[PDB]
Amino acid sequence: SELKLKPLPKVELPPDFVDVIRIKLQGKTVRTGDVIGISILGKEVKFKVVQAYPSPLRVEDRTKITLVTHPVDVLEAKIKGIKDVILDENLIVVITEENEVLIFNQNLEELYRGKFENLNKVLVRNDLVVIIDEQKLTLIRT
Amino acid sequence: SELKLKPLPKVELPPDFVDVIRIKLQGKTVRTGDVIGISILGKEVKFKVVQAYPSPLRVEDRTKITLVTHPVDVLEAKIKGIKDVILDENLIVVITEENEVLIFNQNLEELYRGKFENLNKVLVRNDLVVIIDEQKLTLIRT
Amino acid sequence: SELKLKPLPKVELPPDFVDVIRIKLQGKTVRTGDVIGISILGKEVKFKVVQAYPSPLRVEDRTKITLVTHPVDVLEAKIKGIKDVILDENLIVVITEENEVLIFNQNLEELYRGKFENLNKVLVRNDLVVIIDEQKLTLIRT
Amino acid sequence: SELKLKPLPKVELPPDFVDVIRIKLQGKTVRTGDVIGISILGKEVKFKVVQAYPSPLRVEDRTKITLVTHPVDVLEAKIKGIKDVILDENLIVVITEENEVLIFNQNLEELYRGKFENLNKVLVRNDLVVIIDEQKLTLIRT
Amino acid sequence: SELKLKPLPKVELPPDFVDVIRIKLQGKTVRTGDVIGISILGKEVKFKVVQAYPSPLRVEDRTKITLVTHPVDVLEAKIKGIKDVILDENLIVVITEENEVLIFNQNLEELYRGKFENLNKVLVRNDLVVIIDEQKLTLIRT
Amino acid sequence: SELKLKPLPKVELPPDFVDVIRIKLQGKTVRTGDVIGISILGKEVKFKVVQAYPSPLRVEDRTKITLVTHPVDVLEAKIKGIKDVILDENLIVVITEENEVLIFNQNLEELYRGKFENLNKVLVRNDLVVIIDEQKLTLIRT
Amino acid sequence: SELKLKPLPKVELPPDFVDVIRIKLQGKTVRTGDVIGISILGKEVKFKVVQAYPSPLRVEDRTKITLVTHPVDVLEAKIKGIKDVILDENLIVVITEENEVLIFNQNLEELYRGKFENLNKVLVRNDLVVIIDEQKLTLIRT
Amino acid sequence: SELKLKPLPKVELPPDFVDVIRIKLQGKTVRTGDVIGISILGKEVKFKVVQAYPSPLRVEDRTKITLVTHPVDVLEAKIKGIKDVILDENLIVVITEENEVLIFNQNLEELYRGKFENLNKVLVRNDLVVIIDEQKLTLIRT
Amino acid sequence: SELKLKPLPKVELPPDFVDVIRIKLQGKTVRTGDVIGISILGKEVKFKVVQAYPSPLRVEDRTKITLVTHPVDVLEAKIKGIKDVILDENLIVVITEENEVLIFNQNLEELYRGKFENLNKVLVRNDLVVIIDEQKLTLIRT
Amino acid sequence: SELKLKPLPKVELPPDFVDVIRIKLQGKTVRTGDVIGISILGKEVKFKVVQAYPSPLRVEDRTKITLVTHPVDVLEAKIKGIKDVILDENLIVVITEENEVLIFNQNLEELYRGKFENLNKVLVRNDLVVIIDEQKLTLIRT
Amino acid sequence: SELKLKPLPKVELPPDFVDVIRIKLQGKTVRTGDVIGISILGKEVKFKVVQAYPSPLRVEDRTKITLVTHPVDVLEAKIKGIKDVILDENLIVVITEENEVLIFNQNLEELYRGKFENLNKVLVRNDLVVIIDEQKLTLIRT
Amino acid sequence: SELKLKPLPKVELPPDFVDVIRIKLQGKTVRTGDVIGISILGKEVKFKVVQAYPSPLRVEDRTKITLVTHPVDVLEAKIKGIKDVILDENLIVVITEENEVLIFNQNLEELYRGKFENLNKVLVRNDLVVIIDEQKLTLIRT
């Protein structure tokens, strides 16, 4: 059991902070990507579960807990057969090998999913995504 | 059979509202872009059909219904044989196989429709669209 | 007990979704602002705990659960005696009545806290915050 | 009683089309934003009701019907007792007499509705809406 | 009878050009604001009727004709009691003393006209015009 | 004979409006690009002759009259053998196969015409047009 | 033989003024850019020679005279064998066959003239002109 | 009596060239903007009169002559009783004591001159000049 | 007594590392901006003292230590009697009670130091700082 | 052995200060970025080691010491086998031979370090770093 | 007598550098603003005479010599009775109490000097300076 | 002996100005690139020594003097085998064929010089220069 946590955006640390975390999170179920509030020294402190191994995970006394210190949010998305990726202002447009078009925002939240038998083009400009086959024009607004 | 819906007023919903929607829409025909009013907790709540796959579609028991929490709009324009598309600042220009030029705005409302026997090139910059054939030059001011 | 949850960014909804949520979240402890992953129909779905009443809260069979549908993140911060607020690009600068300067980012995460006996000025431009008393100049970079 | 209409596809019309439209609308109720399909020369053409004065209205013999060649769109939202409005980039923020805050986009689609007991100031910049009372600071991220 | 004409954008001038114009416009009816093509020296030349006195006017031998030379389009609109004018990109918003709102483009074509019993505010930003009374919010897109 | 007219920016339509137009324009001579004021229902209404076929044309009983509905100004200019067209801010530069350079504005008014025996280059930037042969440099400021 | 003229004050002209101008310029020499004063109705009016084709030219009876409205100016610089030209923000950079570099501003006023034995490349950005040969690097600051 | 001059080609001059110039201009009249050719070392060199103080002026022995390097130009327009001036992007707008409005470009070339009986306000933005009096609204499009 | 620290390499830390830091730094003197290397898990890890309140400070047992997860920098410049401060694009200009002007960059590195007997005004725009006294004008180019 | 130094406060120095600095640094080890305090005229002045060649270096008698008047800063980060680097707005992204990705800011402070087994492409835009392999897509939000 | 010199952009410093400078500049005449090359350690080094007090000055054994270290160019110009200063892009416009207008560039080189008996206004925008009295409008383009 | 001088920015010229300059520069030593103030007609006039042949040079009666008239600063730097030059805002980056990197400002003052055994890349963006070999990353801030 591994818990990789990231304080948001900071934490005042008491002595033996690991024992405290273990006691406060004892028996809880945790998944990768979760955000958990923990009462420390009388004040609420949020932690992003950067990684739970495995996920989900039940926090036990044997669970190893580490602090993540990078001032950056890491977000992942499993996508089968990525043909091309287009990047605009807080827009991420992914086209798959089977002509499926996906639209994500800055938090990597899936804003749009579409299937297109034929697929001539996909254009991106600012808030706009235009999808072109040989029968219709599809416009998607963010 | 797939439905992606979202409420027009951003009100809080009971989690089983999907059942109410299913029984209400059972056997009815739904297209992308439709707006359907449904009584919830004694008040009518309007729902926009963000996407229907396919469209049109007849709601069955095995139809997947999805709640959307983002202001995505999906617009379509049925156009036969799209050869190429140009995307500029709030202008969408479409050129077909039969040498037709169509001009849309950012809301996919048609601003112009035209046919050209000969057709060499099509240029777009800001509010201006220039169309070049073998005989004449056509200036279109948006 | 009240749980106001917001799907991120969407959820495919099964019949009797409330019973499912109640069963999956049964006996868990939840605070306002948390983000929880829930396995639904074989797929992981994240929910932002928009509000837990009270907070923290232990999910029981009597707990009323509602879905939040607004495509917007609401973030709150309790600050005693707000004298003035300055707003720049993803920067929120707050000055208190007792000459305390606070700097928040776009996620309302406290980036900086400072106490200043005397306080002549606070200036903001882009990434920069300049703090002026009668003894030193304090610059804070975001 | 006045109707301002425009065709959705920008096609060439015979000058007496208004008569057929009149026979179509004789005795019907029409509001601003309505879409009316009418057969012209054997093909269906959709017309948008750019404006109806008043709205709603029942078409009579003395109802004036006007063809519009400009791309104006008119949207309205009934809100009782509007105290103040802030207009930013594709954001419309409305504050009522009872300290209610509503946030719309450029299509006048509701992004948020919230009520606030105390209310000192409301600041808007880009995607950010800051609401300031005497106790806490509320950040709304669009 | 007086005709004030403007070449668009130029005219090659023959001897006794006044007699030429008089003969070519023989028996025609002319209104202020019209644009007329006249065959001069074997080439079509466009003239803006900058002013017809009176308007409309029937061109006779007694009609006095003068050339306007300013490289600028002058457009006029009679409005009783102008309270305020707001000016943006190719947008002219006029508010009268009796709360009438008018919206013109760069060619002074009346894009919008509205009456509002109560009237708190009128805001303009780019393509958007927002009108605020004490009952509803009106959004106008250009 | 065909007359394609566009109301500017709108027209209140009477019954049998085609007969009305035919009667009002009876015996008049019309060229493509003309703008004509016609008194309809007691108010002056401007019509752009979007196209007269042929041009010029004498309106007769056989003349087919149609209304144009596109919210766009279409301007045409016959140019023999267009080699290349350059597009900048409200500037349209056309180069012919016989080394002639033409410069138009946003209204397709011929601002400049020039012949150049030799012709190496034509560069465009903002208001400036630079023409290069093997003997001199020509600068044209708009 | 062609003259393109325009009055300096944009005042109204009698249509036959060209005749008077002709009497004034009979047998005289006219160049591009010249300013010619002519008495009309008892008052002097100055006319700029927008273009003289060719220039210089001797005015005859067969000289074509055109009235111009738009404020176009034509500037020329005789330079033998222009190899390439770079056009930047208010900077015109010319390179000749024998490796001569000349720098002009937007008024075609000569800012610099220099000769370089070897000549590899010439770079331009804003106020800076960088000249690269086989021996040294030359920086020219505008 | 002062002359500020500069050569048109930026060529190297002998330090005593001013004497030769003096011999050339003895007893002649020199104005601001004039171009004077003078033989130096057997080759003609053109000199622009950057400034003549005053202008016009008759050259004497007591005339001060200054060599200027920087490409400054001085343009003037005699206008009696200038009440106010508005300076925008390549537009100079002048309002006189008797409510006359004159519009110039960046070359001080007159684009428009107009008289208005009453005169409330004058607004300027980009290409648009709006004139507000007690009777009508006048739009001037540059 | 307060310490806000953050690691220079963004490595994962054991949660009780604060104990190690406390025992390592017990009785030592620490100032804001200091960089202190501390052995963790057999590897030296450098920690930047983001803020020490007060500074300097001697680490005790009751000293609060905070982990920071963001790239905040805190810079200070001790300057006696600061009258006013101007913040522009990457320039910070300070004016004191004793008429001293100091110029810093965005990293708070001193670019200029100057004293002025008389002192009227100080203007800042981009790279230029203009200083106006009763005698002379001083231009400072950054 | 070469030292390039500059004073932190921009004070006036006696020309022989380098001697005192030499006596201060005799036999000491100096690296790039070091800060060295030296008493001049009775007051301590800090000097930044802008560059040391080589670094580290031990000051000898034959060590060259240079006074610098330009505001250049030089930062370096030892990274074994740098495969590629992408430079955006205050973001420096480094990719190594072993497919390691490191993200730094404009102060060369480490924001992130991560290792990726497979690695097709890395895209950068504003605050966004997108990492694309054959299985998943990784978004890094700065 | 004081000489304040600044190396451009750096100087390698020999022992007893003051004696060296004194010997190399012995008996030379120096004015504020001069730039002098001095051979030091076998290499030419430029020094800007940041200040000579008095100016001019003859370097003698009594002359006090100091090094200036600020990474900034300081330029001064004595102007009697400065009423107002306007600052634009690389443009500095100064108006005196005796209605004299002076125009400087980024290097404080006097680009323009003008006297105006009456003086209503001075407006600055980019390269343009507009001067308004009660008889004429003066435009100065830089 | 030849002196090529440039007035900054102007010079009032007396009769026999060459003799005057020769007498005023009597016995002085002059280097290429120097700036010298000379009292002429009672006013200090600055001259850039554009070229001294040879350099340095002692002004004698045999010295030939010419005036340079270009309103531009010409700066030269001898660099053997220039492989590539990158140009940004007031930044000039030069890479030699033997992997030497040099960084100059707008005044061609050598801001940075570096040797790199291995050398993969050099990137430039605004104030930043990044240098990449196979062992370290070098960042240079301007």
Three-state SS across G85-118?
EEEECCEEEEEECCCEEEEEECCCCEEEEEECCC
- State the DSSP H helix or E strand holding residue B54, giving kind and residue range, or none if neither: none
Three-class SS state of B81: coil
- Name every residue in J having a CB less than 8 A away from some CB of L: 70-82, 84-85, 87-89, 92, 94, 104, 106, 108
CA dihedral (J10, J13, J15, J16) positive or negative: negative
Gap from B4 CA to chain C (nearest CA, Å): 9
> According to DSSP H, which parts of G4-55 are helical?
17-25
Cα distance between residue H114 and residue E88, in whole Å: 23
Q: What is the amino acid identity at position G106?
A: Q
Interface probe, candidates H110, H111, H112, chain G, greatest G C-beta count within 10 A: H110
Q: What are the chain A neighbours of B89 within 8 Å (beta carbons)?
A: 125
Gap from A25 CA to chain B (nearest CA, Å): 28
Cβ within 8 Å of residue C27, ≥6 positions away: C58, C59, C60
Cβ within 8 Å of residue H104, ≥6 positions away: H77, H91, H92, H93, H94, H110, H111
CA K5 to chain CA centroid, nearest Å = 14
- Say whether I82 and C128 touch across the interface (CB within 8 A): no
Q: Which residue do the tokens 């850019």 mark?
A: G33
- Say whether J88 and L140 touch across the interface (CB within 8 A): no
Q: What are the chain E neighbours of G64 within 8 Å (beta carbons)?
A: 12
Instruction: State how far the alpha carbon of H55 is from the alpha carbons of H76, K131, K136, in Å.
Output: 11, 17, 14
Q: What is the amino acid identity at position H51?
A: Q
Instruction: State how far the alpha carbon of B105 is from the alpha carbons of A99, A123, B112, E141, in Å.
Output: 26, 15, 10, 12
Cα distance between residue K100 and residue J46, in whole Å: 46
Identify each DSSP E strand in chain L by its residue range. Answer: 2-8, 10-12, 29-30, 35-40, 43-53, 57-58, 64-67, 73-78, 82-88, 91-96, 100-104, 110-115, 121-125, 128-132, 136-141
* Tokens linked to I10: 């963004």
Do F7 and D67 touch, CB atoms closer than 8 A? Answer: yes
- State the DSSP H helix or E strand holding residue I5, giving kind and residue range, or none if neither: strand I2-7
Looking at chain I, how many residues does it have?
142
Cα distance between residue L65 and residue H15, in whole Å: 7
- Say whether H140 and E107 touch across the interface (CB within 8 A): no
- Say whether E77 and H139 touch across the interface (CB within 8 A): yes
Q: Which residues pair with K9 in a beta bridge?
A: none
Cα distance between residue J15 and residue K68, in whole Å: 10
Gap from D39 CA to chain B (nearest CA, Å): 19
- Say whether J75 and L140 touch across the interface (CB within 8 A): yes
Cα distance between residue D104 and residue D108, in whole Å: 5
Q: Which chains touch I (3 or more CB pairs under 8 A)?
A: A, C, J, K
Do F139 and G108 touch, CB atoms closer than 8 A? Answer: yes
Do L85 and L102 touch, CB atoms closer than 8 A? Answer: no
Angle at I79 between CA C83 and CA I8, to 5 degrees: 80
CA H36 to chain CA centroid, nearest Å = 18
DSSP secondary structure letter of residue I13: B
Do H21 and H14 touch, CB atoms closer than 8 A? Answer: no
CA E132 to chain CA centroid, nearest Å = 29
> According to DSSP H, which parts of E10-137 are helical?
17-24
- Name every residue in J having a CB less than 8 A away from some CB of K: 4, 6-7, 10-19, 64-71
Map out the domains of chain C as residue ranges.
1-70, 71-142
Nearest to E139 by CA among B51, D33, H69: D33
- Say whether E17 and G18 touch across the interface (CB within 8 A): yes
Cα distance between residue G25 and residue G37, in whole Å: 10
Angle at C117 between CA C116 and CA C118, to 5 degrees: 95
- State the DSSP H helix or E strand holding residue A19, giving kind and residue range, or none if neither: helix A17-24
Nearest to L6 by CA among L35, L41, L43, L30: L35
Expressed in Å, this structure's resolution amounts to 2.7
Do G110 and H8 touch, CB atoms closer than 8 A? Answer: yes
Nearest-CB residue to L9 (from H15, H18, H69): H69
Do J32 and J74 touch, CB atoms closer than 8 A? Answer: yes
- Say whether D137 and C88 touch across the interface (CB within 8 A): no
Cβ within 8 Å of residue E33, ≥6 positions away: E48, E49, F35, F37, F46
Cα distance between residue H104 and residue H90, in whole Å: 8
Q: Please state, as a whole number, how many other Cβ atoms lie within 10 Å of the Cβ of residue C140.
A: 22
Q: Do chains L and D touch (3 or more CB pairs under 8 A)?
A: no
Do A43 and A53 touch, CB atoms closer than 8 A? Answer: no
- Say whether K139 and H92 touch across the interface (CB within 8 A): yes
Do K128 and K141 touch, CB atoms closer than 8 A? Answer: yes
Nearest to A96 by CA among A81, A108, A86: A81
Q: Which residue do the tokens 């027009």 mark?
A: B8
Nearest to J68 by CA among K103, K70, I12: K70
Q: What are the chain H neighbours of K105 within 8 Å (beta carbons)?
A: 70
Determination method here?
A: X-ray
CA dihedral (B73, B79, B80, B85) positive or negative: negative
Residue K9 sits at φ, ψ, to 5 deg, of -100, 5
Cα distance between residue H119 and residue B129, in whole Å: 39
CA dihedral (L44, L45, L51, L52) positive or negative: negative
Three-class SS state of F20: helix
Angle at G43 between CA G37 and CA G46, to 5 degrees: 25
- Say whether C85 and D130 touch across the interface (CB within 8 A): yes
CB burial of residue A24 (10 Å; 0-12, 13-18, 19+) = middle
Cα distance between residue K32 and residue K49, in whole Å: 5
Instruction: State how far the alpha carbon of G129 is from the alpha carbons of G93, G120, I27, in Å.
Output: 8, 14, 60
> How does DSSP assign C17-45, residue by residue?
HHHHHHHHSTT-EE-TT-EEEEEETTEEE
Instruction: State how far the alpha carbon of B58 is from the alpha carbons of B20, B47, B52, B53, B65, in Å.
Output: 17, 17, 10, 10, 13
Cβ within 8 Å of residue I74, ≥6 positions away: C112, C138, C139, C140, I32, I33, I50, I51
Residue C18 sits at φ, ψ, to 5 deg, of -65, -45
Cα distance between residue J55 and residue I52, in whole Å: 31
Interface probe, candidates A12, A19, A24, chain I, greatest I C-beta count within 10 A: A12
Q: What is the amino acid identity at position H133?
A: D
Cα distance between residue L86 and residue G122, in whole Å: 12
Which residue in A has a C-alpha nearest to residue J139's C-alpha?
Answer: A75
Q: Which residues pair with J109 in a beta bridge?
A: none
Which residue in J has a C-alpha nearest to residue K50's C-alpha?
Answer: J12
CB burial of residue G103 (10 Å; 0-12, 13-18, 19+) = buried
Q: Give the max Cα distance, chain J.
A: 67
Cα distance between residue J92 and residue L130, in whole Å: 9
- Say whether B72 and A125 touch across the interface (CB within 8 A): no
Which residue in B has a C-alpha nearest to residue C64's C-alpha?
Answer: B14
Three-class SS state of K133: coil
Interface probe, candidates G26, G66, G69, chain E, greatest E C-beta count within 10 A: G69
Angle at E110 between CA E106 and CA E115, to 5 degrees: 135
Cα distance between residue A100 and residue A83, in whole Å: 10
Q: Do chains J and A touch (3 or more CB pairs under 8 A)?
A: yes
Q: Please state, as a whole number, how many other Cβ atoms lie within 10 Å of the Cβ of residue A95.
A: 21
Which residue in H has a C-alpha nearest to residue L68's C-alpha?
Answer: H12
Q: What is the amino acid identity at position I34?
A: D
Peptide bond into C56 cis (omega under 30): yes
CA D38 to chain CA centroid, nearest Å = 23
CA K131 to chain CA centroid, nearest Å = 26
CB burial of residue J126 (10 Å; 0-12, 13-18, 19+) = middle
Residue D66 sits at φ, ψ, to 5 deg, of -120, 135
| Beta strands I82-88 and I91-96, pairing class | antiparallel
> How does DSSP assign E86-114, residue by residue?
EEETTEEEEEETTSEEEEE-TT--EEEEE
> How does DSSP assign L32-69, residue by residue?
TT-EEEEEETTEEEEEEEEEEESSSEE--TT-EEEE--
* Tokens linked to I127: 């790279």
Q: Which residue do the tokens 């207008």 mark?
A: K101
Q: How many CB pairs under 8 A join G and L?
A: 62
Nearest to K76 by CA among I114, I140, L34: I140
CB burial of residue E93 (10 Å; 0-12, 13-18, 19+) = buried
Cα distance between residue E126 and residue E133, in whole Å: 21
Gap from B55 CA to chain F (nearest CA, Å): 29
> According to DSSP H, which parts of H99-139 are helical?
none
Compute the radius of gyration of chain C from its Cα atoms.
Answer: 21
Q: How many CB pairs under 8 A join A and J?
A: 60
Nearest to B92 by CA among B79, B106, B80: B106
- Say whether C15 and B10 touch across the interface (CB within 8 A): no
Order across the sheet with I100-104: list the strands: I82-88, I91-96, I100-104, I110-115
| Beta strands E10-12 and H91-96, pairing class | unpaired
- Say whether D109 and B9 touch across the interface (CB within 8 A): no
- Name every residue in E having a CB less than 8 A away from some CB of G: 4, 6-13, 15-18, 21, 65-72
Cα distance between residue L83 and residue L86, in whole Å: 10
| Beta strands A91-96 and E121-125, pairing class | unpaired
Three-class SS state of J15: coil
Torsion of CA B55, B56, B59, B61, to 10 degrees: -50
- Say whether F123 and G80 touch across the interface (CB within 8 A): no
CA dihedral (D55, D58, D62, D68) positive or negative: positive
- Name every residue in I having a CB less than 8 A away from some CB of C: 51, 53, 70-82, 84-85, 87-89, 92, 94, 106, 108
Cβ within 8 Å of residue I114, ≥6 positions away: I100, I101, I102, I131, I138, I140, K74
Q: Which chains touch B (3 or more CB pairs under 8 A)?
A: A, C, D, F
Order across the sheet with G110-115: list the strands: G82-88, G91-96, G100-105, G110-115
Q: Please state, as a whole number, how many other Cβ atoms lie within 10 Å of the Cβ of residue I9.
A: 15
Q: What are the chain H neighbours of G69 within 8 Å (beta carbons)?
A: none
Nearest-CB residue to G110 (from H9, H73, H112): H9
Cα distance between residue L87 and residue D136, in whole Å: 50
Q: Please state, as a whole number, how many other Cβ atoms lie within 10 Å of the Cβ of residue A76.
A: 15
